[PDB]
Curated annotation (Swiss-Prot):
Keywords: Exonuclease, Hydrolase, Magnesium, Metal-binding, Nuclease, Nucleotide-binding, Nucleus, Phosphoprotein, RNA-binding. This is Decapping and exoribonuclease protein. It comes from Mus musculus. The 5'-3' exoribonuclease activity is inhibited by adenosine 3',5'-bisphosphate. Its cofactor is Mg(2+). The keyword Metal-binding applies.
């Protein structure tokens, strides 16, 4: 087991390598994979009065969340690019999985599970939906469903499909569509290969080379008091920082929503400056604690997963308050590396 309290992980900010984009892939409106950037949209801010409720629900095509894709689309990319043993000493995951590790020392509400499998040296990490999270997903109240749509809608007001184009929110929001950047990094002694969904690219960004040219878009409720801002800095900026820090996305652009579902204000939060909001806060978060924990977890997983075997899973389970605990599983349902990937890699 691995303890999770922040005090264990205070100390110097560890080494995190400047991320390089190795490539990308797109999922289209039918969730079919394409090894190019067709799904990538372009940051096109107002020059805001955005109705995030517009099109809900008649122009809404939500992804079927029952389909658990796990690492499948990343593994296709890896398979088609394993000529770009560095991989053997790496850990392969989704950006979002690493985000959840980053936020663990401070997370008090949502637990997680991560399946680990070692296969020809490489450590693969793939999130498992917990029974409790599966319960909440199926029991999603109308208001949660509207809120989620609103987050996706915001993007349609802020992005165009061509550089410098005008946003066109008259169409449908279809959440099968995704653009994913594939990045290489390293946290201390742990080489990383991961994909992350990317909201848009800013043509007028100072550095036009990805991932620096990318922008993350967010919505949050409007705030009218120091206390509301302080809770926002403490809870939501931590999540936003941990999401955008990893892939090297330098800006998060937030639209603040009315209780009536309109965005009438925008604010840019540079990733590099987010921690400043809580640096002198007795109940704030700390990016060095986030990264030190993550590095500790990677070391823990790497020493725990001894056997090289794609049918074997070490399930890392964590609930708020407690340590990360481990259980050992084989085959269904936890085994996540598909035959089509294992055989092709074995073929080499
Ligand atoms: Mg976003």
């Amino acid at each position: 087991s691995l303890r999770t309290q922040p005090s264990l992980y205070s100390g110097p900010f560890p080494f995190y390598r400047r991320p390089s984009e190795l490539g990308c892939f797109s999922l289209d409106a039918q969730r079919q994979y394409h090894g190019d950037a067709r799904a990538l949209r372009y940051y096109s801010p107002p020059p805001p009065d955005f109705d995030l409720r517009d099109g809900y629900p008649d122009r809404y095509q939500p992804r079927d969340e029952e389909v658990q894709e796990r690492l499948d689309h990343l593994l296709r990319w890896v398979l088609e690019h394993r000529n770009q043993g560095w991989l053997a000493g790496a850990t392969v995951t989704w950006r979002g999985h690493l985000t959840k590790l980053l936020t663990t020392p401070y997370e008090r509400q949502e637990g997680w599970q991560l399946a680990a499998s070692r296969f020809q040296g490489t450590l693969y990490l793939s999130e498992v939906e917990t029974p409790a999270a599966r319960a909440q997903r199926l029991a999603r109240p109308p208001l949660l469903r509207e809120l989620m749509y609103m987050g996706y809608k915001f993007e349609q007001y802020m992005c165009a499909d061509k550089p410098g184009g005008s946003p066109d929110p008259s169409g449908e929001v279809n959440t099968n569509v995704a653009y994913c950047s594939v990045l290489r990094s390293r946290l201390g002694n742990h080489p990383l290969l991961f994909s992350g969904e990317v909201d848009c690219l800013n043509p007028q960004a100072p550095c036009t080379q990805p991932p620096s040219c990318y922008v993350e878009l967010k919505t949050s409720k409007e705030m009218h008091s120091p206390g509301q801002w302080r809770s926002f800095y403490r809870h939501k900026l931590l999540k936003w920082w941990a999401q955008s820090f990893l892939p090297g996305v330098p800006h998060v652009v937030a639209g603040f929503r009315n209780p009536e579902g309109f965005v009438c204000s925008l604010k840019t939060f540079p990733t590099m400056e987010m921690f400043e909001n809580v640096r002198n806060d007795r109940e704030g978060w700390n990016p060095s604690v986030c990264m030190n924990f993550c590095a500790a977890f990677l070391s823990f997983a790497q020493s725990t997963v001894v056997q090289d075997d794609p049918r074997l899973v070490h399930l890392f389970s964590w609930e708020p308050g407690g340590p990360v605990t481990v259980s050992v599983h084989r085959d269904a349902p936890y085994a996540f590396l598909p035959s089509w990937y294992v055989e092709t890699m074995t073929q080499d």
